[PDB]
Each structure stands twice: as structure tokens, then as C-alpha cells.
Amino acid sequence: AGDLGNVTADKDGVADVSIEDSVISLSGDHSIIGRTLVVHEKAGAGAGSRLASGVIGIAQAGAGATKAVAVLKGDGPVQGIINFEQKESNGPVKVWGSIKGLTEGLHGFHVHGA
Prior knowledge:
The structure is a monomer. The chain is built from no helices and eight strands. The protein has about 110 residues and is mostly beta strands. The protein has an eight-stranded antiparallel beta sheet with strand order 1-8-3-4-5-6-7-2, with no helix packed on it. The protein is elongated and about 40 Å long.
């Protein structure tokens, strides 16, 4: 699991994220909690990108529900906060937040090692 497509940074270097994914889970036996979220700092499909990254940490939530947060840190100004929420065990996961400092355009976005 873990592919989250690409995010799009604007001319200000801000990528607002709003995704739902049902391949990843915050629960069950293959949870992404504790995995590292990564964003390519190079725009587009080219090899040799540096990465901004952060570990997906548990946040207090409810009952069968789970919330998690990754604080992304990269080079120079790249930084962001990405939230994950899952209402029921092995249900769809909502992924949302924002990343700043990015070059304008498409950036690969995915959970590593999941």
C-alpha cells in the first residue's frame, strides 16, 4: 500500500492536499501508523529528487476511529502537516493538509515501506 499520487504546488510553492484512499489503512494488520510519508522535492517524473518526509504518528481520536499526523520536513523551506483519518476499521482513509516551500508543479506523494 501507500501510493498517494501526486500533489500540486502553486506558484507560491503551496500544495493543498485533499485525497481519499482505500488501499492504505490506519488499522487492521497492515496499518501505516509509524511509516514515513514522503514528498519528492523535484517537480515532475525525473529521477534524483531529494525527499521531504515525516513519520506518521498517532493522534488521540475515538472508537474504531483513528487519526494520525505526519509533520513533513525537507530542505530549505519545505515543510508541512498532513492529517489522516479513518472512521472505521479498514475503511477509507481521508488524507488532508498542506505543504509549503515546494517548486511549482507536480510532486510525487506516498507512504514509504508500506
